[PDB]
Amino acid sequence: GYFKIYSKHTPIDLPQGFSALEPLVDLPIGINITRFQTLLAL
């Protein structure tokens, strides 16, 4: 029931390197999730 979102932002195929991801947001949602979708701007 906890939604964890970890984020990382960097200035630059996948770049070759190492970069740890710090935690960003913890949410007490408590729902069932099994599918997702992205959103775009036109």
Place this chain on the structure above:
Amino acid sequence: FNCYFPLRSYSFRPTYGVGHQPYRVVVLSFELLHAPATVCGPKKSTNLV
């Protein structure tokens, strides 16, 4: 005949007895589910030695 409106109106007056006085009532029901419980009580913080 044999047909009545299901709702009756309370006729409250300031000179009625304790058995007819208007009482405002709130029922608080607390539920816990699989989701992380979030309705917490205030936590008193002791000064630090």
